[PDB]
Design a protein around this nucleic acid. Structure first.
Ligand SMILES: [Mg+2]
Ligand SMILES: [Mg+2]
Ligand SMILES: [Mg+2]
Ligand SMILES: [Mg+2]
Ligand SMILES: [Mg+2]
Ligand SMILES: [Mg+2]
Ligand SMILES: [Mg+2]
Ligand SMILES: [Mg+2]
Ligand SMILES: [Mg+2]
Ligand SMILES: [Mg+2]
Ligand SMILES: [Mg+2]
Ligand SMILES: [Mg+2]
Ligand SMILES: [Mg+2]
Ligand SMILES: [Mg+2]
Ligand SMILES: [Mg+2]
Ligand SMILES: [Mg+2]
Ligand SMILES: [Mg+2]
Ligand SMILES: [Mg+2]
Ligand SMILES: [Mg+2]
Ligand SMILES: [Mg+2]
Ligand SMILES: [Mg+2]
Ligand SMILES: [Mg+2]
Ligand SMILES: [Mg+2]
Ligand SMILES: [Mg+2]
Ligand SMILES: [Mg+2]
Ligand SMILES: [Mg+2]
Ligand SMILES: [Mg+2]
Ligand SMILES: [Mg+2]
Ligand SMILES: [Mg+2]
Ligand SMILES: [Mg+2]
Ligand SMILES: [Mg+2]
Ligand SMILES: [Mg+2]
Lengths: 167, 122, 111, 185, 127
RNA sequence: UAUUGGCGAGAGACCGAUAGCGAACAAGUACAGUGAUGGAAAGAUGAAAAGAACUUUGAAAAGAGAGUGAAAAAGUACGUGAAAUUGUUGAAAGGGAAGGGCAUUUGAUCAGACAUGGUGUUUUGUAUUUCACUGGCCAGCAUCAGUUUUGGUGGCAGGAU
RNA sequence: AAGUCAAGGAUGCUGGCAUAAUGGUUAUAUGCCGCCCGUCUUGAAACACGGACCAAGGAGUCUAACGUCUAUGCGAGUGU
RNA sequence: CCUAUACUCUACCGUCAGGGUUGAUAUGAUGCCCUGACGAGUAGGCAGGCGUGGAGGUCAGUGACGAAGCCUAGACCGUA
RNA sequence: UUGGCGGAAAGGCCUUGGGUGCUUGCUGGCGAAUUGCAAUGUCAUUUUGCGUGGGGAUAAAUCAUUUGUAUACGACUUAGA
């Protein structure tokens, strides 16, 4: 023989893990995130845009909308860690946001064979957006310049220190 | 192999200051060039597109003699002969084209950006 | 050395955070009163606070308690030593000697 | 760094797992380390350490020594245990009816013991007869009776047997041994 | 197909080379310890080469393991291969260098029948 | 009984061509010294010379072809053909050395895992199969554990209360 | 109370890629560090000695008589 | 306020010490497992290993479908 | 596009007139989604090459020869349609 043998072979039966003791308490959001707060999206495709915060979802995500008529941000979910809670507050009583949850946003996962060589929207999603924004804009019309404020993007100018800036 | 040889004007053609006229080496090299041209025309080559593509020289076994030095000493007096070889080839056209397919791997975000630009433009 | 008079708070924090006994010549973390009542149960000591009491009120069995206690392995002080140069006397602006009651701050930083 | 008050990583200095490669001795020490681990008796630990011993630390034990040890009061019916070999003795004439447990018996010792009505026992039969050393009597041979210990600690005014090959007159019985030749050691 | 194992970490993935193996050709790069009296390598001066020591020893749970997670085992024939029949998740076959191609095909066939991993399934093959 | 000589044999946990006798070869040879003496180096094409007919360039040696051969990466400078050193090609760097260690960028180059059993037969070769997932790399968030750092705030106790 | 828990060591959810992307090796660049090895010496980078380079060879061996220790066989015997 | 290979905590390697574990099934009791501490090093001592020539045994081992050797900024294992 | 000014390294500054585009000074309408909860998420300028189609101009130097105000050799100084 080339190699002789091992005198004893390691057993192939994989052991079980110990009974772990990590329960899952619900997330405690920060104090500035109340429903109806204007947030600034710091990252993503819609970075630098100001959107209204609606609902704290199940998987620690924030349900937001532009509104879509204002700045083109649809009904979407974002991470609470990637936003800035501006103290500008709008009142969101008058929307039935209990329809949406984590299964409302499903990606319909793609197989490995479907490779995009070179290259649509739910009617339910666009009509839900149209339902919520028509109630939001009635509250937006109350205070002045809020529509233009939400349509404009946020950016840092020369001399803007975010550790001294208030939002 | 140019240390402590003399300077000359005829190196200006080559941007150098040190050049010589090694007549024996030129004799041997042009004899080999004539032999390679004969082999090429026997092969049936164009004989006007011929350029010397490869030519190399390396050291042959030395041929040794003795030198008699002061206080009754012996030293070596050796020739360093040469193995010379050369290959003359026909000057061909442009080599090739059509490089690799360059398979691309794009993330979903990059694909969405490309699709958004294709939609936002014509 | 730097020595002084320890308070109950720093004694308690020492024994609770860095509490190690000498059990058949091994450095055993305390972490439970069963160890202490097994190794010092002869002389009435049952718990870690009973051991602390025997330590601070220097009782009849302080020798046994302190010898059961492994020497405390402290770190460097978290806020520094307070002086630019250590090895002078505490009176002369250094660190060694008897910093009679200021040892509590130093030990709480080092612990 | 540490201010070490001892030598670090020093061995215990005590032999475990005997240097021999006798497989029967390995089986015996396996049995007796099990017994020393669980039977809570000191006899098992004693014979376990004695199984480790080298040849010069296992001197032979004579049957005359065994008889002398049995002539102690209250020991007439004990089980003699010799971790080592048992040699006989023609210097005795009567021998009791004892039982002897040992590693090896010489032919004469075994014959004497079984002729006196007793029996020769191996240590595993001893273990199944007395796991905790019931009514046992451990015997050790004389260690300092070897020829090597005569020369141990040689020096002036020791009386300690110089290492020498040939003996007699004119082989180190002169200057340094009598006052007529210089000095006396 | 390997057994679950911790993340294999090598404390020193770089090869220990003998001092001045780059300097001289007669000095090979196999490690020898400098036993000299003035050696900066032996005295462990800052900026010199590191010496092998036991602190660099690999974890015993991940020792002798390939990145696939198995231990290699040299085989020369199918009878040596069949010892790994019950240990496919721990050992990986390695056909010896002096095995002919007409035997390598047989070893490879038996290994793909038995599910045993071969870590050189490209020796001496023709196409 | 002795026997490092001679003749004839049989052997070896011996050496394997810088070894082993100085000498595996035209070796006590070539050679040196007046002389007594001193005293080397040097084995291997291939199974078989089948040792390259013949054409062409060259004054010729040789080259290029052709051919023999299992192989001329075996051509009487011949088994295998290392290193020092050298040539060509390719790549890279280079302001009074070069080389090295830690770390990463950049360039080049490279191994591994990606099926898995699986409800399932949307099935053809009618029992192969029809299969949605599988597992690997890199991350982000939440709730925790250990160690630690930086803040905010509350309630007490002491002094000449 | 069922049981639960931050109580003798991390689990849960989600995304991208599934390839040289992470990573390894190697060359280069950059930041910092890095004196030439061996030796004798209190002290070597030394203006102390050997070393131009490379292959091969190259230095605590065997024997007689013994000391300690260890292993083995037999044991008042032992050693064919 | 800066930072040492110093101190604290954790992981991993090795050493030493103290322990546990023959029960049936399956292997290795010099094995496996738990706990704690420790780790500089010339001369020198000891231990565990790697490699070379040859000898006994075994793998009814490899091999002209290519052994040995040699080259290889190709890969893997081992602290070496 | 007119007229100036600027030489320290100006290579830029100012100005006339008209054209054209935008204007968030103010009020409106439509669109954005799917990059799926982040992944620089790519928008700058530096050089070179190759094509087109539109202008613009049609040389010298070196070797060799020669000179000797020069010179170890190079170099230098001269001459030669
Ligand atoms: Mg010069
Ligand atoms: Mg000269
Ligand atoms: Mg002469
Ligand atoms: Mg002469
Ligand atoms: Mg600090
Ligand atoms: Mg200071
Ligand atoms: Mg230490
Ligand atoms: Mg080298
Ligand atoms: Mg020194
Ligand atoms: Mg010879
Ligand atoms: Mg010779
Ligand atoms: Mg061949
Ligand atoms: Mg050949
Ligand atoms: Mg050859
Ligand atoms: Mg070379
Ligand atoms: Mg924490
Ligand atoms: Mg904190
Ligand atoms: Mg007060
Ligand atoms: Mg790479
Ligand atoms: Mg990388
Ligand atoms: Mg790299
Ligand atoms: Mg480098
Ligand atoms: Mg420096
Ligand atoms: Mg001196
Ligand atoms: Mg000097
Ligand atoms: Mg000298
Ligand atoms: Mg010299
Ligand atoms: Mg050698
Ligand atoms: Mg132990
Ligand atoms: Mg030999
Ligand atoms: Mg081969
Ligand atoms: Mg190489």
């Amino acid at each position: 023989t080339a190699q002789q043998a091992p005198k004893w072979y390691p057993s192939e039966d994989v052991a079980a893990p110990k009974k772990t003791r990590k329960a899952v308490r619900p997330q405690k959001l920060r104090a500035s995130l109340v429903p109806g707060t204007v947030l600034i999206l710091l990252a993503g495709r819609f970075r630098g845009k100001r959107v209204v915060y609606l609902k704290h979802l199940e998987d620690n995500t924030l349900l937001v909308t532009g509104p879509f008529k204002v700045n083109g941000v649809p009904l979407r979910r974002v991470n609470a860690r990637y936003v800035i809670a501006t103290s500008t507050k709008v009142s969101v009583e008058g929307v039935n946001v209990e329809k949406f949850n984590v299964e409302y946003f499903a990606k319909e996962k793609l197989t490995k064979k479907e490779k995009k060589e070179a290259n649509e929207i739910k009617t339910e999603r666009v009509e839900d957006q149209k339902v919520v924004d028509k109630a939001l804009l009635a509250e937006i019309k109350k205070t002045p310049l809020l529509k233009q404020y939400l349509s404009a993007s946020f950016s840092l100018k020369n001399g803007d220190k975010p550790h001294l800036l208030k939002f | 192999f140019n240390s402590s040889i003399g300077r000359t004007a005829q190196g200006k053609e080559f941007g150098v200051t040190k050049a010589r006229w090694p007549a024996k080496s030129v004799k041997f090299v042009q004899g080999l060039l004539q032999n390679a041209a004969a082999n090429a025309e026997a092969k049936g080559l164009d004989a006007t597109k011929l350029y010397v593509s490869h030519i190399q020289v390396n050291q042959a076994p030395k041929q040794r003699r003795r030198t008699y030095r002061a206080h009754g000493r012996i030293n070596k007096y050796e020739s360093s002969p040469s193995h010379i070889e050369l290959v003359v080839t026909e000057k061909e056209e442009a080599v090739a084209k059509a490089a690799e397919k360059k398979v691309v791997r794009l993330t979903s975000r990059q694909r969405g950006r490309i699709a958004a630009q294709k939609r936002i433009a014509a | 050395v730097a020595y002084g008079y320890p308070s109950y708070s720093t004694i308690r924090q020492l024994v609770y955070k860095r509490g190690f006994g000498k059990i058949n010549k091994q450095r055993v973390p305390l972490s439970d009163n069963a160890i202490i009542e097994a190794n010092l149960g002869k002389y009435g000591i049952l718990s870690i606070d009973d051991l602390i009491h025997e330590i601070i009120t220097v009782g009849p069995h302080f020798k046994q308690a302190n010898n059961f206690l492994w020497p405390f392995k402290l770190s460097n002080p978290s806020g520094g030593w307070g002086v630019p140069r250590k090895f002078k006397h505490f009176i002369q602006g250094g660190s060694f000697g008897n910093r009679e009651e200021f040892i509590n701050k130093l030990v709480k930083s080092m612990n | 760094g540490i201010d070490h008050t001892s030598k670090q990583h020093k061995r215990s200095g005590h032999r475990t797992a005997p240097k021999s490669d006798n497989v029967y001795l390995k089986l015996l020490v396996k049995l007796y380390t099990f017994l020393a681990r669980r039977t809570d008796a000191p006899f098992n630990k004693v014979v376990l350490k004695a199984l480790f011993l080298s040849k010069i630390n296992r001197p032979p034990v004579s049957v005359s020594r065994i008889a002398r040890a049995l002539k102690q009061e209250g020991a007439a019916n004990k089980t003699v245990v010799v971790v080592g070999t048992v040699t006989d003795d023609a210097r005795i004439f009567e021998f009791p009816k004892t039982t002897v447990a040992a590693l090896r018996f010489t032919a004469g010792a075994r014959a004497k013991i079984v002729k006196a009505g007793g029996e020769c026992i191996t240590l595993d039969q001893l273990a199944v007869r007395a796991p905790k050393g019931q009514n046992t009597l451990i015997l050790r041979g004389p260690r300092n009776s070897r020829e090597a210990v005569r020369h141990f600690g040689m020096g002036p005014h020791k009386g300690k047997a110089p290492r020498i090959l040939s003996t007699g007159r004119k082989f180190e019985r002169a200057r340094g041994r009598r006052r007529s030749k210089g000095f006396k050691v | 197909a390997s057994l679950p194992h911790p993340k294999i970490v090598k404390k020193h993935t770089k090869k220990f080379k003998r001092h001045h193996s780059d300097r001289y050709h007669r000095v090979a790069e196999n490690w020898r310890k400098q036993k000299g009296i003035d050696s900066v390598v032996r005295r462990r001066f800052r900026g010199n080469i590191s010496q092998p020591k036991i602190g660099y020893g690999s974890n015993k749970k991940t020792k002798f393991l390939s990145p696939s997670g198995h231990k290699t085992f040299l085989v020369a024939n199918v009878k040596d291969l069949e010892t790994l029949t019950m240990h496919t998740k721990t050992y990986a076959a390695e056909i010896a260098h002096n095995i002919s191609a007409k035997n390598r095909v047989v070893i490879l066939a038996r290994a793909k029948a038995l599910g045993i991993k071969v870590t050189n399934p490209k020796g001496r093959l023709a196409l």
